[PDB]
Amino acid sequence: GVEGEGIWLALGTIGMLLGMLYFIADGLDVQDPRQKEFYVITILIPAIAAASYLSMFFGFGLTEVSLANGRVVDVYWARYANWLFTTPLLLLDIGLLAGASQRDIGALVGIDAFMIVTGLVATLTKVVVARYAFWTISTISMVFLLYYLVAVFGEAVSDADEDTRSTFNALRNIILVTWAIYPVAWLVGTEGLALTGLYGETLLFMVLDLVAKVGFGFILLRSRAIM
Ligand SMILES: *C/C=C(C)/C=C/C=C(C)/C=C/C1=C(C)CCCC1(C)C
């Protein structure tokens, strides 16, 4: 544990609200249907995240887990429900942009669900070796996620014009750079090796989420590529 983390839950919440509020204000002049499909998907992401963050702020979706070890971890489980719904949407979004087939997006969200699910079990087990084991398999599968991202979506976008290739790189980079830190944050946070407390791990996830979501969706929506 180590409380006071709710300040990150509050600022996280409102950043989502603001990002979501902005995308609406910006998607007001929108015209082509496909562009509109992008706006629903993008605005859907911090929406869900904000509801998730609001529940955590009000203390819902918290849960204590006494480890075999003896230690007890306060674990925010709403977080993993958040990720369950939100990550297949960022994948869909970048996927649509890349012009990847639903077969390919679907295969990528298939391994995303496994990653977030096994991450959830690692967070919740009492047996501490199994925490680290399910952590290992989760990040293994995140590496295949990242591989098929750069290669399957990458190959789909190679036929596309310069600006949807440059937009897709900008988004591919964000995912690579920011999704890769999530499992290290789990590791050094209280859920893993506990180098930081609950307060600093929370801070970390909050920052990562805002750029995975508002930063990401900002770049997508604001782009000559989608009109
Ligand atoms: C907006 C939320 C996002 C982009 C969440 C991304 C989540 C991950 C990249 C999760 C990674 C994890 C592992 C690779 C295993 C260790 C535990 C997890 C769930 C943190």
Curated annotation (Swiss-Prot):
It is a multi-pass membrane protein. The modification N6-(retinylidene)lysine is found at K213. The keyword Transmembrane helix applies. The gene is bop1. One of its GO terms (molecular function) is monoatomic ion channel activity. CDD domains: 7tm_bacteriorhodopsin. Coiled coil: none annotated. The covalent binding of retinal to the apoprotein, bacterioopsin, generates bacteriorhodopsin. Keywords: Cell membrane, Chromophore, Hydrogen ion transport, Ion transport, Membrane, Photoreceptor protein, Pyrrolidone carboxylic acid, Receptor, Retinal protein, Sensory transduction, Transmembrane, Transmembrane helix, Transport. The record marks N82 as: Primary proton acceptor. This is Bacteriorhodopsin-I. The chain crosses the membrane at residues 5-25, 40-60, 80-100, 105-125, 133-153, 174-194, 201-221. Its main location: membrane. It comes from Haloquadratum walsbyi (strain DSM 16854 / JCM 12705 / C23). One of its GO terms (cellular component) is plasma membrane. It is found in: Cell membrane. It holds the Pfam family Bac_rhodopsin. Belongs to the archaeal/bacterial/fungal opsin family. GO terms for biological process: phototransduction; proton transmembrane transport.
